[PDB]
Amino acid sequence: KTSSRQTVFLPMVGLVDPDKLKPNDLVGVNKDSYLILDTLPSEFDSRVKAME
Amino acid sequence: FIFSPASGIVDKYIGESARIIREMFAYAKEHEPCIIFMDEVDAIGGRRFSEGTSADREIQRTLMELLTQMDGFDNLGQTKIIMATNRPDTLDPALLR
Amino acid sequence: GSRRYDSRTTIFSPEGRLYQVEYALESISHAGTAIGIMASDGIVLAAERKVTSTLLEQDTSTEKLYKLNDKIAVAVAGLTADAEILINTARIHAQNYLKTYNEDIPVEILVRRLSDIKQGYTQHGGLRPFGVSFIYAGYDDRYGYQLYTSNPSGNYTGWKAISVGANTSAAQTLLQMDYKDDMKVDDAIELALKTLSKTTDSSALTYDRLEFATIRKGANDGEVYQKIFKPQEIKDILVKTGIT
Amino acid sequence: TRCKLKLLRMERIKDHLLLEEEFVSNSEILKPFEKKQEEEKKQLEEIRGNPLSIGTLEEIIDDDHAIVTSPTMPDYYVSILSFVDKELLEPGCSVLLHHKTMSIVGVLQDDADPMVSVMKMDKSPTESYSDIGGLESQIQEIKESVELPLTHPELYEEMGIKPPKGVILYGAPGTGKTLLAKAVANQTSATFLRIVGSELIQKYLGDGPRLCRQIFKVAGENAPSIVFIDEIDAIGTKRYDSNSGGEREIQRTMLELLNQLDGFDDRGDVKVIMATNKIETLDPALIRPGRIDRKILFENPDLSTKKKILGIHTSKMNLSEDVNLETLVTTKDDLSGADIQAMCTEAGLLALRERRMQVTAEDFKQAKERVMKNKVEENLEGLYL
Amino acid sequence: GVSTLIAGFDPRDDEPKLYQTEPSGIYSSWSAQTIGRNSKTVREFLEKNYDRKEPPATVEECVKLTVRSLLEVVQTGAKNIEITVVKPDSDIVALSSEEINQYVTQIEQEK
Amino acid sequence: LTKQIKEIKEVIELPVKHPELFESLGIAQPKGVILYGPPGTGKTLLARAVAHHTDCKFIRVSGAELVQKYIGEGSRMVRELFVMAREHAPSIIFMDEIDSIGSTRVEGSGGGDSEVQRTMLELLNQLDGFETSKNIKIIMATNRLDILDPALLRPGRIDRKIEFPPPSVAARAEILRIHSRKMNLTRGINLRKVAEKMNGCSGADVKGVCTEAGMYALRERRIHVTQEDFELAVGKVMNKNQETAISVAKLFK
Amino acid sequence: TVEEKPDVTYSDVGGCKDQIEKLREVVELPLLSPERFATLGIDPPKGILLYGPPGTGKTLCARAVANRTDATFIRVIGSELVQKYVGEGARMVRELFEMARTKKACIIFFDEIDAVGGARFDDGAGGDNEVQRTMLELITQLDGFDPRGNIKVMFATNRPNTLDPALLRPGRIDRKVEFSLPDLEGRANIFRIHSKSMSVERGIRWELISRLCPNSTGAELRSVCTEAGMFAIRARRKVATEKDFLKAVDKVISGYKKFS
Amino acid sequence: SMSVALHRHSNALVDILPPDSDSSISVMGENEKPDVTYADVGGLDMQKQEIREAVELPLVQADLYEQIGIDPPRGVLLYGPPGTGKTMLVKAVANSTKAAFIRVNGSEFVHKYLGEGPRMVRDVFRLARENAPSIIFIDEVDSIATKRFDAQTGSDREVQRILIELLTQMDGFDQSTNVKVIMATNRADTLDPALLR
Ligand SMILES: Nc1ncnc2c1ncn2[C@@H]1O[C@H](COP(=O)(O)OP(=O)(O)OP(=O)(O)O)[C@@H](O)[C@H]1O
Ligand SMILES: Nc1ncnc2c1ncn2[C@@H]1O[C@H](COP(=O)(O)OP(=O)(O)OP(=O)(O)O)[C@@H](O)[C@H]1O
Ligand SMILES: Nc1ncnc2c1ncn2[C@@H]1O[C@H](COP(=O)(O)OP(=O)(O)OP(=O)(O)O)[C@@H](O)[C@H]1O
Ligand SMILES: Nc1ncnc2c1ncn2[C@@H]1O[C@H](COP(=O)(O)OP(=O)(O)O)[C@@H](O)[C@H]1O
Ligand SMILES: [Mg+2]
Ligand SMILES: [Mg+2]
Ligand SMILES: [Mg+2]
Ligand SMILES: [Mg+2]
């Protein structure tokens, strides 16, 4: 699901592991044609911070 | 198997609970054999309102949406519900029938 | 303890107004229509029952019309249960006046006494007042025929024509157009029936659901005869006035 | 006849003369376009192009650049260009940006908006004092506050206290506070802006506040001024939905207004008129009691007051020779001027129905009956009897 | 919820007495007073139409002053207007509507 | 609805055709018309009826007007309605909203729906001046005054408060009169039977008899409606009402 | 919004109140003599939460002490400003806090942190949640360099039921004080300052107006004086009497009691 | 005004669509009732007849009704205790009609938006007309209808809006070529005061 508000079905790219790719893994995706380029750490909201 | 608590589906956004069990249901219809575990249904239980607030009327809609999926124009196939309730007295005759 | 379960039932509101009396007027609007019309030869009291059924014996019933004394009868509009207490208080009071002065009670005195009881209950004791409105037909020598309405607060007001209970507004407006001071008991009987046919509490007005009573000075030697008409004597008058 | 002839003389020579002079001048201008002019107009076209997108100037950065916000969702860092400079611009002004490559190429709007058009009015109010007649004591609270420091601020200086600042018209509907605001502002001799606070509510973001800001800028140019923000109650505190909202922008707008009350310099020269149904229809968060000064409390016309109001209405009403004013007043109890207005109109309707030119006293009773109808109270004799 | 105006004479006295009692349990004497609806309005009228120093000299001017005060709020003929006069030492007369009508007409015409 | 027809001709027709006559004999112009009364009285049907003869564009507008969102929100098409209506002159706007907002947002002037409605109303005054007089009628229709919006609330605040009565026996008989032609005329003229037996609170109840009557005729395989077809038909419609009326007519105190 | 040692004393604050002597104890005492605290082994207080009804004069008092104690005064009010928008107000909070700390002998006031440095506002008039970033920054900053060299932190809240528990914990707040609705004689005093500035009657009883009033804030007493001015102008006098203030109190009481 | 096709890259009107398109799906299952017939019923034989008379009969024979002279059958309200199939009653009949059938729910008229909900009920009503005759069954209207009118927060007002629009639209304008909408209810205590009727 892009931050451009689209849902896109991608062929898995050989570069990354299928084990990093989870529900809400933040992912780099190629700007042009859309292919999972890389992985990114998760960001956490201010709601997360107070609690923890 | 979908273990879902029923106090877990409740949101102030109206028809969100009705949306959640409808999708859960559509998933179950595909994923046969499937048992849907509605645990602690007592949370969205009770009956009446319409002098209540629209949160209750949504709980009554959800409770009713349940009612839609089981019997109506949709049916169960090799889908199956188990409902768990911790008090049968919160639980309503429309689901003890 | 005792104060825990009390809510201070009888008190003023910020407007000055007594909660239980306001509530009481609602419950008298549930109860049937009762109309009184004061003619220049009598008083006609005509009431439509709040209950009717084919299994209900209404041919011995006198559930609205009750005689307090020989010259004063009432029609009832409100709770029958509540009214019963005031009815037997009135009988005792009228007989008490007769015992002590050997003279029949004037209509003013009897009404005032009942009114004091109703005020008293909201004043002290935390008691609910009687939720009834009565129309008193009475004769006395001094003021002649006198007509009175009493309300559940405990206040009485004179009239010439008046209605209490259900359809008070509708009955009143018809009376204003038709009433005249040259009316006789004959004319007043016809007016009462017509008004009840336009203020009917279902879709029909019948003899068997009508209670009817007059007090007429047409009895010989200037004496007053209270006649409570049976439903088949009402039926006779129902064909006379052309309701049927 | 001769009063016509003299006006005729003046008005013909001035109009006619002018037409001929304009007609010749359009030619005399266009023939020479040599030297300075041709050069100027040509450069201006080249730097520009077609089409030109509306913009807004948020701020100037002191290096001949600016931060601008477009009607498209993006915002942009642009260069200041052309004949229009940052000295000639000021923040919050609407500016022309060239479509392809965003740069300020000019201005022709000069801070003209469809909100700006509605607010503007520099003419005197329509109502003069006691059109608006009567609620004299109410005028004798608004005038104190609104007319008097503008007229002579001196008075307060000799008194030795801060001038008044704003007024809050609040209390009963149907007393004409929306009319009254007009009446006073005529008398003073000042400019009268009028804007409805419902048009400062926007579903677009950052737009709400821009619209509030335009008001005080305008107000200061044309000072002394009385600004009427009609219905501050309509910003209120309300909510459209709570499951898709709408209740964010309301706050930001309310806030932008509380700040420029005091914050547009401590002056009673930037007066405000806030009409409100009650104070508890507003956001309860409020500025302190003296910052808004006196709160003006409208209440029901008394017996004397509604003779005045009634009298105004019925003079306008034609063919009522069978009506006497007093008898109308006797039967009625205290009521707004609003309902007097309705009764007089319902009485024309009845008499038009009947097909009879005349308007009777009898007629009017029928109109009283209709207005009073569903105000009935039987708990009045519930307490009394 | 009841306040009273108690007035009269004492035996062998021609001094008029006008008192007001209220449901608080307090009472006060007054030269003139008004209670009930629009008591403020009638009272304001009485500030200019009654002097502490000088009451109405005659019975008739007192009667017409009370009719005049009622004709502010009450209005609507002599139907709803009542007047009771008490004169020294047990002389109570009640002035019927006919008497009141005459007084009303005189005030109306004069005004 | 005999009275109602006669009142509303003066209300709707006459300002349109002669705005000056309306002003001369009486005063002012209407700034609105508000229809209210019990359901089923046919107030919606009335506004359609009068508008035919008026010869203007009866647009209607059904329901709430926050419903537009697919080209943009409905939170300013209320306001701008003033403009839209002006363009399509001469035009009659049947902005309907039956009301279910209650008593809650009457207090204050709360609600965002009520604001926008309020804004249109503030606009609404200007129409007597923006192209002179009125020629466009703003006919609002609501069920009651209790459930109403705050801005529309007070008598004559949007002009013209007209209560629609429940129909009389004579009126019920006339409502019946017209449906009889449409159906096959009764044998034995038993039209008065229905009218005497019950009187409704709606023109809908009358209508309910016509349809009910044709269930029984259909079954019997006789087209023509008869007294017997009628007696069954009034008994069916009155059943609904007798049952709730026996519980206060019997077993009461 | 920021100022710099503004000239206000206790003379100009109407009355001396308990809440002023609790301010003296937080603010003056460690600045003047951090010595006595040290020898004692009690920690010097530097945290104060100020809460009460508005218009009590809390703002006058902070400045009063600012002048006395001789410390530069930095006022930030976050719900007055428009700096709140998704952590845009987080920058206001970060920057000014660090700047003030650089300055020696200084007072930092974040005022009206009911929101904008206060609790969530989802259930509120708005549907905001922008406020929780600005709250996030504020929490950290009061532990980043303590002991702060005798720099005092003030906080304004109307209701202290709108302030986050992380904020409420110790070190951030070392004194808690409720501002009290000023007494009748204490209103004679708040009135006295406004009345001395106004050309008035000499021999006026201040105590007569304060008797007539019930408990009213000092802001009200400031409005009443302006109001009396107005009625004085209307009669064409520019010298007021006890009479213009009898009027002025009647206007306010009937006016405000009913609503807000 | 109705839906239509535009080219992707020419951005113009090249082709037309039925208005049926871009509107609610009509039965999300297959349209007809599963093997359950009048044989399986087991009721309620009489009352099922009354449902046939109301729903299928006008649609099959129009001419017959024209003979009686009556307007065609009004909406049906199915109320009673549950385990009466009342829902199955409509499905069984509709099976045998051989006309379009529309299956939207009251729990599908829901929204978390502004006026999006009333807009959904609107697409059904128009859509019924286009694929005429049509049998409209709404499974629930219990908490989509309100006896007491509320508007406590904004979120009470959204439910109310759907009620308003349902009534007004119900109603006849051009007059219905449908059977007039069918609704089912566990009880009528959670319906409106008098607006059903
Ligand atoms: N002083 C007056 N003299 C003449 N007519 C008046 C006067 N006051 C009010 N009216 C009449 O009553 C009408 C109602 O007044 P107006 O529209 O200003 O109400 P409002 O008090 O602002 O109510 P809301 O609470 O709806 O804003 C006026 O349009 C005018 O016709
Ligand atoms: N006077 C009449 N003549 C014939 N049919 C009538 C009449 N009045 C109403 N009806 C019938 O009753 C139906 C319902 O009436 P309608 O929906 O127009 O009512 P309303 O009073 O405007 O209600 P709401 O309160 O729902 O806005 C009509 O469609 C029609 O079939
Ligand atoms: N007449 C019948 N013959 C055969 N089976 C039947 C019959 N009636 C009902 N049943 C069985 O019972 C089930 C329940 O009926 P249905 O789903 O229609 O309930 P309902 O009365 O509409 O309840 P709710 O109040 O939840 O809407 C049916 O699916 C069917 O299996
Ligand atoms: N105690 C007082 N003596 C004098 N004026 C007072 C008093 N209290 C408040 N006021 C007046 O009200 C005004 C506003 O109060 P302010 O200092 O902003 O306070 P707060 O923070 O409590 O809302 C002051 O500037 C002053 O004019
Ligand atoms: Mg207004
Ligand atoms: Mg309708
Ligand atoms: Mg402050
Ligand atoms: Mg079902």
Curated annotation (Swiss-Prot), chain B:
GO-annotated cellular components: nucleus; proteasome complex; proteasome regulatory particle, base subcomplex
GO molecular function: ATP binding; ATP hydrolysis activity; proteasome-activating activity; protein domain specific binding; ubiquitin protein ligase binding
Coiled-coil stretches noted in the UniProt entry, renumbered to this chain: none
PTM comment, free text: N-acetylated by NAT1.
Keyword Nucleotide-binding: yes
Source organism, top-level taxon: Eukaryota
GO biological process terms on file: ERAD pathway; nucleotide-excision repair; positive regulation of RNA polymerase II transcription preinitiation complex assembly; positive regulation of transcription elongation by RNA polymerase II; proteasome regulatory particle assembly; proteasome-mediated ubiquitin-dependent protein catabolic process
Key words, A-Z: Acetylation, ATP-binding, Nucleotide-binding, Proteasome
Protein task: The 26S proteasome is involved in the ATP-dependent degradation of ubiquitinated proteins. The regulatory (or ATPase) complex confers ATP dependency and substrate specificity to the 26S complex.
UniProt similarity note: Belongs to the AAA ATPase family.
Protein name: 26S proteasome subunit RPT4
Organism expressing this protein natively: Saccharomyces cerevisiae (strain ATCC 204508 / S288c) (Baker's yeast)
UniProtKB/Swiss-Prot annotation, chain C:
Record Gene3D superfamilies: Glutamine Phosphoribosylpyrophosphate, subunit 1, domain 1
Signal peptide coordinates: none
CDD domains named in the record: proteasome_alpha_type_4
Cross-link annotation Glycyl lysine isopeptide (Lys-Gly) (interchain with G-Cter in ubiquitin), location: K99, K198, K230
Biological-process GO terms, alphabetical: proteasomal ubiquitin-independent protein catabolic process; proteasome core complex assembly; proteasome-mediated ubiquitin-dependent protein catabolic process
A GO CC term attached to the entry: proteasome complex
Subcellular location: Cytoplasm; Nucleus
Keywords, in A-Z order: Cytoplasm, Isopeptide bond, Nucleus, Proteasome, Ubl conjugation
NCBIfam families: PRK03996.1 (NF003075)
Quaternary organization: The 26S proteasome consists of a 20S proteasome core and two 19S regulatory subunits. The 20S proteasome core is composed of 28 subunits that are arranged in four stacked rings, resulting in a barrel-shaped structure. The two end rings are each formed by seven alpha subunits, and the two central rings are each formed by seven beta subunits. The catalytic chamber with the active sites is on the inside of the barrel.
Homology family: Belongs to the peptidase T1A family.
Other known facts: Present with 17100 molecules/cell in log phase SD medium.
PANTHER family on file: PROTEASOME SUBUNIT ALPHA/BETA
Name of this protein: Proteasome subunit alpha type-3
Curated annotation (Swiss-Prot), chain D:
SUPFAM superfamilies: P-loop containing nucleoside triphosphate hydrolases
Alphabetical GO biological process terms: nonfunctional rRNA decay; peptide catabolic process; positive regulation of protein catabolic process; proteasome regulatory particle assembly; proteasome-mediated ubiquitin-dependent protein catabolic process; protein-containing complex localization; ubiquitin-dependent protein catabolic process
PROSITE patterns with a match to the protein in the record: AAA
InterPro entries cross-referenced by the UniProt entry: 26S_Proteasome_ATPase, AAA+_ATPase, AAA_lid_3, ATPase_AAA_core, ATPase_AAA_CS, NA-bd_OB-fold, P-loop_NTPase, Prot_ATP_ID_OB_2nd
Effect seen on changing K177Q: 73% loss of ATPase activity
Highest taxon above the source species: Eukaryota
Protein transport recorded as keyword: no
Keywords, comma-separated and alphabetical: ATP-binding, Cytoplasm, Isopeptide bond, Lipoprotein, Myristate, Nucleotide-binding, Nucleus, Proteasome, Ubl conjugation
Annotated ATP binding sites: G171, A172, P173, G174, T175, G176, K177, T178
Cross-link (Glycyl lysine isopeptide (Lys-Gly) (interchain with G-Cter in ubiquitin)): K182, K203, K238
A Pfam family reported for this protein in Swiss-Prot or TrEMBL: AAA
GO cellular component assignments: cytoplasm; nucleus; proteasome complex; proteasome regulatory particle, base subcomplex
SMART domains found in the cross-reference section: AAA
Gene Ontology MF, one: ATP hydrolysis activity
Family from the record: Belongs to the AAA ATPase family.
PANTHER family linked to this entry: 26S PROTEASOME REGULATORY SUBUNIT
Stated name of the protein: 26S proteasome regulatory subunit 4 homolog
Taxonomic placement: Eukaryota, Fungi, Dikarya, Ascomycota, Saccharomycotina
Curated annotation (Swiss-Prot), chain G:
Domain of life: Eukaryota
Entry keyword set: ATP-binding, Cytoplasm, Nucleotide-binding, Nucleus, Phosphoprotein, Proteasome
A cellular component term, taken from the record's GO annotations: proteasome regulatory particle, base subcomplex
PTM sites of type Phosphoserine: S33
Misc: Present with 105 molecules/cell in log phase SD medium.
Entry's family note: Belongs to the AAA ATPase family.
Gene: RPT1
Name of the molecule in the record: 26S proteasome regulatory subunit 7 homolog
Organism from which the protein derives: Saccharomyces cerevisiae (strain ATCC 204508 / S288c)
Subcellular location: Cytoplasm; Nucleus
Subunit comment: Interacts with UBR1 and CIC1.
